[PDB]
């Protein structure tokens, strides 16, 4: 329960915080990992990372803690982060650790006196309690469902299938032979790994690709050049190996009625949540129009085109359109794509004059901003457009 | 995004608001129902009501709106109310209505000038947006699940079974013949009714009594003397009739692992969420100890004793104890109960020395406060005790 | 020439700016590209981008403009950005455009009144003049050198060589047959492209890979999956095609004497500036120790190993060590690498006990922070470590 | 990172500083040279000096340090001084020395109390860091270039040529037989000398007179009556002697395209940077008009007229005009000059109606202000006029 002065003391120190931007963050993470190295088992330590997740975390604490009074407007961003933390199994003790390093860094870098450090300790504390409370609800929801569980659960890789030159799907089934939790199409799983070559345990989020069946899950991974986890899954993981999973979480999912037209836009592996959504619509006999717009680099790298076809065939009103950005000669001779180049919806055969249509988007940031702006230029309201990033959360 | 002055203007008017307590509330509801009578189809209009739900709603708006800065601490209460609103299908337009009547009442009763009314309009608005945002997430979650739906759905009563002289269970199956949403044991359904004798549509919350099966639901209702909906369900509703349901919601549910000992305490019809919890544990082969402590007035009114027996028999470590507060002569000659009188856990054979045991409670307020205080007097931590009221939310 | 009040007016609006973080930025870029679409020919419009460059630009303007009094400490960051702008040919007119959109966005989003907007206009103006002045000096330096030029110059691709499965080098020679500017090993070129499939003109920075020779340049590009410019250069560009270049710029370069031991650390294509540095040392007969530590994923993707060998052979004191993170069976049978796994300098044969040794680093952010922290853990002072990012600038 | 009070404390002491003008400066230099005599090896100690360089240095520290907030506007003057310091090899330790003597003088002269001295120490420090940072970049740039070096390098005088009765050129080649750095026409060299008759080491700046060739440099010195270094170079220095040089620096240079008309104005030895510019244009085949306007006292003292002729002959559009201020009888009989008297451009045959023409000027201050004002009176914009002083920097 903060008061005006504490709140003004924190906001008064914000201008001092933004001009030290990167230095500050580095000092904070260098102090964290030195005294609390065990956190290296939760943060990404791959030499291939770019440092965005770290930067976003710290900036959010600074921006959220200083405007804790206006928390109301921050709740949608808090929900998105809380869902993600749940996959990384963030706990209340870790908030204490991050709090000690934040205040110690502020002191070490500025020596602001006790009043300032106390204020920041109170504002951070309130913010940390907001996340701890919501994350406790989600952990509880996940363990209460049928087939749900607390923490990490062991799952055997029961099938490894190459769906293209870059994507391979992995079927997973609990080692305990029991039921697995249900989820909302568009959500993801937390995959914890630490084969013997890993110097640290790595955790990655992979979307669920089909309708829930209470038996197992199916994820599809793209092999990223130099990527630690995707290359291990593609070159070393084998059917028979066991990995640990954290229940399904995520604030991006499809919620429509039977008469709600839906459009699923995606580029490359960003089609994984869309597959779960398409499978769900097909198995439900969705009666309204369903569109599947996808862009792949070429036919070599394009995955799941056969599954998408059989699923749309089962729907009453379904339309699919694929764009190959750089079709090979063989691709042109097979004609397995509709248009070449970027996804130009504006040139499709017929627009979506249905105000009730809902659009889901998932690809790289430039792709989603280019494709979401085409939609509003066509008249689509922003509240009907939904999207998800496979990296830190962005906005357009 | 409020500022210090607006916030101080609202808090400065709070002392003026608490001394007008009941008058104020009456003027607000009298103005609401006069200009917006359609809300009579959502609020309880039964002549048997006591007016607590109205009183709590208004007091919460006054207390929450004036301490909107400290919203963080209010989130657990906001979640409980948001889950309940979801059954009543509260919408954003209705928040506008409640806001117009709140400010109009303040003006009509005090003529505070525009500054005060503007402040209250801004604080209320922020509070209304918090509920609208969380309730929009829940509506989305409910429509995204398999078998889930938006709004109201028609369900046929496929079975009416008398389980005691006061309780009758009703099995319900979608009229559309499709799958129904899953839920977390301990949650409830929103039952919308308006047979031809009702002057208004009434909405009641009934707990789900068994493990989810994706096909239908089973609720158990106690006939309350003079109660509008329970007497219609007991004396007029018939197998074949159709009622409307709103997806399962609720913040009170069981979330345990397989090795988490659980204790289910209940009095009378308060055993309904416990049945869903016991059925869930039994079907999961729960290995840790499971206790079923129940209190009924007598054998005539005691329901589900046979089901509870067969379910516990299927568990490895199960212990049941029943207390009849006023056993009849016939009850004593049948010996279908363990102890007579109030639920005195302190005299049971063996306490719960397991610090990891979780306790769920559900009965009238006096029963739950008497039984929860026995547990902490025995050493049980408060965070291991969970409970739910079948009326406005209370605290002990 | 600002005064205390203007400066305090801008800093007082900073807390309002950080809590609108992403929204604000989006509104600013959406307004820019709508009214000044021609800027799409300068910013990256690839659908493969992640939006970091945009985010960093806007955040820097907010953080720099509000602490313009402390510009002194910002000059090293200003130099790094000014060098980069020079490749994109940023001009004073464009600063006017960015200024109009910044103030219009502030007004549109907050309606702060004229005083606030005037303050921000004055602080931004001072900041824009700092960049315009330094960038004018650099443009002048580039056009004054021998073989130097203003703007863009046409260069023919005279040689296309595949150096590995992912990297291909391109030799470039002026179409005018004249001399080309010299540069400082570690610097880069600005490559402007717009073949016929591009919807917009794209500009990318590629490091110079050899010692300057006043005749032409040689860049080495890694094919990024889905990357617009690298895939065009690898799959469509041909010897004979003409691209436009902007003189060499960059604040990251090697500056050592003949007796200064040097260590060149790099991962993958990050070895491009190191090649220019190694070629320079070899042609100068560097007498002090020169180390070449490189990490590649495997032998298929490892490029320039033969060139590095012949160059080190020409040096008196040279030591090379290569780490393959995921050696293939064929790689192990050829033995063309020293160690497998991550670059663990701590396990090399002998440390760098030379306090005068200078270290240059270039790879992904995680790689450079992991490798730079190993060096200071070994005792290397931070001022002896130098590095460069192929994406926005980071810090560890 | 200064604050309002420190900044106001320094500005409040400025009126006290300007009324002590010369006394103050003398006390500061007398205290410097007493405690830090080694600085006599860097400052000019010739008995022929007039004391302007000292006066300007001290006044700049007072004026810059007190308006450190408005540093932005001072950057062009900071660059000019930083380039010059680089020839004198100024270092960070020396800034500490100048700082100790500045504050000690303030105390000794006024006894202002600690608050004032602390403020001045903080403002000076910020200013000293600005110069140290830029000078570190320049030292790095100079050592990174090909043929570049750190510090001082030995160069043998390989040729001594008398070009007139007052000017003699000296060719210099590294004693190490290696390549020498390139430079921008108009820049200068730092020549360190201390033959055996010198009581102190003297450092002078001499412009480079030809296009860079990576082999050696050629400077042309005017014998100043009583001048220490110019008389040693003219009367005692011999081919074979070795002097020390500091890499080329300077902010005054020519930066034009091939179609940029250029005008080179100069009086006497001020033609040295112009020769480097003319040689550069001639070797590049400059296609636009090139003018060479020069004024010498007479034919005896006029140097390089033959070189300028052969160079202009090699250009397509070249026009030369020479003015002898006091032609001798022999000069008039030879007709080796165009007009007699001062350089009156206004009476030339045809003006420069080309708005894109760039003008470079170099002679004494009166000559440059007289000649630059003629140009703007003719319509030439000020930003197209460039000039350099062979003494402290002035302005007209
Ligand atoms: C909610 C969510 C859902 C996801 N669902 C899936 C899914 O269904 N399938 C799937 O394959 N992945 C999915 N991802 C992404 C995935 O979790 C990881 O990024 C991935 O597995 C990285 O693995 P790693 O082991 O290769 O590499 P790391 O070592 O972390 O490497 C990351 C790699 O990405 C590369 N990269 C390419 N473009 C970018 C870019 N724009 N920014 C940053 N790095 C870039 C790097 O070069 C590097 O190889 C999801 C991510 C999120 C946040
Ligand atoms: C989360 C939740 C879950 C519930 N689950 C169930 C369930 O599984 N089964 C079930 O039978 N009911 C359950 N209820 C209660 C139920 O929703 C209603 O109170 C009930 O159906 C009232 O119905 P009505 O039609 O009889 O009467 P109304 O006309 O609203 O009458 C309410 C009646 O309750 C009587 N009453 C008795 N004690 C009290 C008291 N202490 N305070 C107020 N009124 C009292 C009144 O005398 C009156 O007859 C739940 C309520 C909540 C909030
Ligand atoms: C100073 C400087 C010097 C450079 N020198 C070279 C050089 O010598 N050689 C060279 O090959 N490149 C160099 N680069 C990088 C290069 O300029 C570009 O990033 C590149 O050409 C991108 O080209 P594009 O056409 O493929 O793709 P865009 O469409 O812009 O695609 C960028 C791509 O990078 C991928 N990516 C992988 N990892 C990441 C990550 N961590 N963050 C963001 N995107 C990621 C994306 O998946 C995507 O394919 C340099 C960059 C800088 C700033
Ligand atoms: C950027 C720059 C570039 C230069 N390039 C050249 C060049 O290419 N060629 C060249 O010959 N010199 C050049 N000079 C000038 C030169 O560096 C020195 O002033 C010179 O060598 C002085 O040398 P010194 O040994 O004679 O005398 P000092 O003992 O320092 O004597 C200076 C002398 O100048 C005389 N003098 C004449 N007019 C003035 C005046 N108006 N103000 C002050 N003293 C005056 C004095 O009478 C005295 O003899 C340059 C100076 C600068 C700052
Ligand atoms: C109140 C404080 C916190 C806030 C405001 C916060 C905010 C964030 C944000 C903004 C992100 C990026 C979200 C995105 O991907 O969309 C993030 C990621 C993450 N957070 Fe939190 N966070 C906080 C506390 C914590 C704590 C205590 C830990 C525990 C050690 C933690 C660990 C993580 C991890 C591991 C990631 C993923 C980054 C990775 O992949 O390397 N966070 N957080
Ligand atoms: C921001 C404002 C609101 C707050 C703080 C609020 C608070 C509450 C509270 C405290 C309760 C009792 C919860 C309990 O049973 O545990 C409640 C019940 C209820 N609320 Fe809300 N409420 C708000 C707005 C609304 C709106 C706009 C409507 C729509 C007309 C509404 C309709 C109801 C109904 C119907 C009930 C059940 C009462 C009954 O059964 O008669 N509420 N609310
Ligand atoms: C005073 C204002 C400005 C500041 C503080 C600023 C700052 C920055 C920063 C921090 C970056 C990232 C640097 C990194 O890669 O290390 C950047 C990139 C860039 N800036 Fe500036 N900038 C400013 C004005 C401008 C203007 C007027 C334009 C012209 C339209 C511009 C165009 C760019 C471009 C094109 C990039 C590269 C991003 C890309 O690749 O898409 N900047 N700037
Ligand atoms: C932050 C402080 C400084 C400022 C503002 C400054 C300013 C100046 C100025 C205005 C000039 C004349 C430039 C002209 O010829 O156009 C100059 C010359 C010079 N400065 Fe600096 N200076 C500073 C610190 C230093 C230091 C620490 C030294 C080292 C002992 C130094 C040594 C010199 C020398 C040797 C000259 C040439 C004078 C001569 O030929 O005798 N300066 N400086
Ligand atoms: Cl990261
Ligand atoms: Cl009521
Ligand atoms: Cl970007
Ligand atoms: Cl002097
Ligand atoms: Na890790
Ligand atoms: Na694909
Ligand atoms: Na009603
Ligand atoms: Na009962
Ligand atoms: Na572009
Ligand atoms: Na490589
Ligand atoms: Na001297
Ligand atoms: Na002359």
Curated annotation (Swiss-Prot), chains A, B, C, D:
GO MF, one annotated term: heme binding
Cofactor descriptive note: Binds 1 FAD per subunit. Binds 1 heme b group per subunit.
E.C. number: 1.14.12.17
GO cellular component, as recorded: cytoplasm
Cross-referenced CDD domains: flavohem_like_fad_nad_binding, HmpEc-globin-like
Chain positions of site Influences the redox potential of the prosthetic heme and FAD groups: 84, 388
Endpoints of the signal sequence: none
Cell compartments where the protein resides: Cytoplasm
EC class: oxidoreductase
Site (Involved in heme-bound ligand stabilization and O-O bond activation): 29
Family membership: Belongs to the globin family. Two-domain flavohemoproteins subfamily.
Alphabetized PANTHER family for the sequence: FLAVOHEMOPROTEIN
Protein's job: Is involved in NO detoxification in an aerobic process, termed nitric oxide dioxygenase (NOD) reaction that utilizes O(2) and NAD(P)H to convert NO to nitrate, which protects the bacterium from various noxious nitrogen compounds. Therefore, plays a central role in the inducible response to nitrosative stress.
Xref: HAMAP family: Hmp
Name of the protein this chain belongs to: Flavohemoprotein
Natural source organism: Escherichia coli (strain K12)
């Amino acid at each position: 329960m903060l008061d005006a002065q504490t709140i003004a003391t924190v906001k008064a120190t914000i201008p001092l915080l933004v001009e030290t931007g990167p230095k500050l963050t580095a000092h904070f993470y260098d102090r964290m990992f030195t005294h609390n190295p065990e956190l290296k088992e939760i943060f990404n330590m791959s030499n291939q990372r770019n440092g965005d997740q770290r930067e976003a975390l710290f900036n959010a604490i600074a921006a959220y803690a200083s405007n804790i009074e206006n928390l109301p407007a921050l709740l949608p961003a808090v929900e998105k982060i809380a869902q993600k933390h749940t996959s990384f199994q963030i706990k209340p003790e870790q908030y204490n650790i991050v709090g000690e390093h934040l205040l110690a860094t502020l002191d070490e870098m500025f020596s602001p006196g006790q009043e300032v450090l106390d204020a920041w300790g109170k504002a951070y504390g309130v913010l940390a309690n907001v996340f701890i409370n919501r994350e406790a609800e989600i952990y509880n929801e996940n363990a209460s469902k049928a087939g749900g569980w607390e923490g990490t659960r062991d799952f055997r890789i029961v099938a490894k299938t190459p769906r293209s030159a870059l994507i391979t799907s992995f079927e997973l089934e609990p080692v305990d032979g029991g039921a697995v939790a249900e989820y909302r199409p568009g959500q993801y799983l937390g995959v914890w790994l630490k084969p013997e070559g890993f110097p640290h345990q790595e955790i990655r989020q992979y979307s669920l690709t089909r309708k829930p069946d209470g038996k197992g899950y199916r994820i599809a991974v793209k092999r990223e050049e130099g990527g630690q986890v995707s290359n291990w899954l593609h070159n070393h993981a084998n059917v028979g190996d066991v990995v640990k999973l954290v229940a399904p979480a995520g604030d991006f999912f499809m919620a429509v009625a039977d008469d709600t037209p839906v459009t699923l836009i995606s580029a490359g592996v960003g089609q994984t949540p869309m597959l779960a959504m398409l499978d769900t619509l097909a198995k439900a006999g969705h009666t309204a129009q369903v569109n599947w717009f996808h862009a792949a680099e070429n036919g070599d790298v394009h995955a799941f085109a056969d599954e998408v076809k059989e699923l749309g065939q089962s729907l009453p009103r379904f339309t699919a359109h694929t764009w190959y950005r750089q079709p090979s000669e063989a691709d042109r001779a097979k004609g397995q794509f509709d248009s070449e180049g970027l996804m130009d919806l504006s040139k499709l055969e017929g627009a979506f004059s249905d105000p009730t249509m809902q659009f889901y988007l998932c690809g790289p940031v430039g792709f989603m901003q280019f494709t979401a702006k085409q939609l509003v230029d066509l008249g689509v309201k922003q509240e009907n457009i939904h999207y998800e990033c496979f990296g830190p959360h962005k906005v357009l």
